[PDB]
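Q: How do we represent a protein-ligand complex in a form that can be generated token by token?
A: Start from the inputs.
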Amino acid sequence: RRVVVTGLGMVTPLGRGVETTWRRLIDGECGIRGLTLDDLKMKSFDEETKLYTFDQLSSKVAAFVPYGSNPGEFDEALWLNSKAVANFIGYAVCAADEALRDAEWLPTEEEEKERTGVSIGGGIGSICDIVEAAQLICEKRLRRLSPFFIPKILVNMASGHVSMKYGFQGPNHAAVTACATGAHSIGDATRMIQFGDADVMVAGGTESSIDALSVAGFSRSRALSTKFNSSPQEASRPFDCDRDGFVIGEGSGVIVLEEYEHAKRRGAKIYAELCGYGMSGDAHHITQPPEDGKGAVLAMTRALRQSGLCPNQIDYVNAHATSTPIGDAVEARAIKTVFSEHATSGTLAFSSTKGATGHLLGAAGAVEAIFSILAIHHGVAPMTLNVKNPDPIFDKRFMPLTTSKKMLVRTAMSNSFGFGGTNASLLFASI
Amino acid sequence: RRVVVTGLGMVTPLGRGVETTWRRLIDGECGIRGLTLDDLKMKSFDEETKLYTFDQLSSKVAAFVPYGSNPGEFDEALWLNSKAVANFIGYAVCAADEALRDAEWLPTEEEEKERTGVSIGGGIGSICDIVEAAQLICEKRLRRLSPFFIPKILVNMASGHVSMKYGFQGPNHAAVTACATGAHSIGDATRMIQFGDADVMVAGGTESSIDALSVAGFSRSRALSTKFNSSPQEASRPFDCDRDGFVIGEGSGVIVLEEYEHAKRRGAKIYAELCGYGMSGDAHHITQPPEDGKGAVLAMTRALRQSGLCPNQIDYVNAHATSTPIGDAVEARAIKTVFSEHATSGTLAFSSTKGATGHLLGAAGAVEAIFSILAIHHGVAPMTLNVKNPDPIFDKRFMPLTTSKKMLVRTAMSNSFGFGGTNASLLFASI
Ligand SMILES: [K+]
Ligand SMILES: [K+]
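Then emit the structure tokens for the protein with potassium ion bound:
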């Protein structure tokens, strides 16, 4: 059984909705701005504590979903209107609603509902909610603790809320694999349709982890950009010589996957086929990839092997590259190993879109899969922002895209790597 | 491709190791004891705050892994060996080591290592570490924030630590589906072997969430047992008329899944075949199952369809039943709906082992899958503990097992349900 994409939905730092996000991405816009006190998510703390906490943050830049009741904005009054709904849940529901309406898949019949599942994972959940609860322990105010505390911090709950809203009674699932979360969630859902567990899967990733402890935590891991705090629009620079860590972003990407014959029967429009889901492990380090990028090589090779395609048949690669000194170079090295002559001749088009969106963490793999599907659909490959001085590994030919380029994209591959050395590679093709 | 089980490993409130856990389970033992101040995991808090917090907890019972350097005990010096290892990670590695040495699978060859993956999920991760970090905000001591904070709290990191320990470079994965986590992780891994993503998968679940905020959070939701604080060994009573909520437990279950031909070629000892992986969603309520238990019915029916077996061919069912008023009754109705004449004849053996182990949350689905496999392997069906007065739903010979029944077990099914209405049913058979 073959698996196709019939609906796209997203909410990103470039806007709410596929149209707005894609338009701004191609136009070369950037969703990164400087942090403020409000961004700490510390409404339950006094101003002196807020001020102190802000000062402890090495990284003072982030990529935010725009909130509001106007076009291209995320309306919290519509999507975060319940006590059990944390921000990551609202993003996923918002994106899922767009994807399902795009796919024209809102079944009323129990037969179809039972054959529709959900696989939308989150990477970390809601740290800010756990911080608020922990404050109750410190201040001896535990009576205030919400009965909805547990339900709103569980990383599988986006799938729960989506399935509930639409009555979807197929597999209720979530893959959680750090920054590969959105990729594995989509991939696992594909395997389920292939095996026959479902005919339709609403799959993707979500994350809303811009808050005091998240920023402080990633800053302590030395994972975040710090030296561009006065110039936020230049903070995320994948493949650039002056990159100094990623910029935390937030949002959700959700797609509607469905079995090919099922899609054709109902006359659904098809974006692309999902042809490869390559998985590997680095088996190296909790946070650092290996020098040779073997894990990334394995993941890409496995996705290729599944599709029955040769390296030279790949038109576009959306790289994971998060704007990290070691990470970006390792992936570049891995892309050279997998594609060799196809890459070193300049034939292969590749870019990282994280200069524009930031690192969406658990949602990164899903959002970037959407970008890859859209590359095929529109015949436009997105640029990498802020590559003023390309990494020494690159030359005149082997070079990431620095402008949005029109081209036939019949095949698009998207890499997502996470802490623990967990790797996924999703390969899409026109059908 | 067929998938078989070649290794078992576990760390539970009934002991470290399969040997001790199974022996104590079958002997009708219980791992539940009363909560103390030390169990709050509040080492960074003063005595006054410890006492306040303890007084605020309505549930004062939990099921603990026995620590120590003696047989049947968890040696924390061996497994909690670095600052990056939270308890859930340590339990998983301990369980994985046992499972792999049982499977006799410690390959040196890059080929075999690349064909071996890991799918061990955690449900919540490490709340206590987030609480400690949040305390640094309240006390303005963020200087002391651990560099390993982020790696410690991520629910996928058990898979990461296991893979790097043994150099496994196959799919590095985690399904996180609340209290179905262990089941979906095992089921997902099965699909991966079935498809050809891997030849061997180290799969299961892990949890260590006995701490101040976890107990407070679950207590506030009214999910936990409160009436039996004076008699802890009586607190978990699945299917009993006096049940009043579940008892939080901790531990890990890990199994080695293997492609059938791969197992036979190397002369591996085979416990059972995994024949069915049924998945569904309630699409009803964030925490409560629907009255008719349609989700449970669907999950069980789906696992049956996949196996090619009919209800009458099922020998043992390990119920999810957690000792909650609504939950247990709903599953009882669902079992009756699926098995009808096979249930009411008294020939279907079914029990919940949560009276003995407590609710292991993310590890529940994996530990109970192991019990289902061991039932087949040993020809003994485990009892339900503390059924003094069976629920009115049970009539005549439709009754859960209240003693360890010696019997031929050819087939065994295990149910796991989680918050968000996520349901999994795993079906094993002799081979
Ligand atoms: K990517
Ligand atoms: K079970």
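The radius of gyration of chain A is 20 Å. The domain at 277-431 of chain A is CATH 3.40.47.10 (Peroxisomal Thiolase; Chain A, domain 1).
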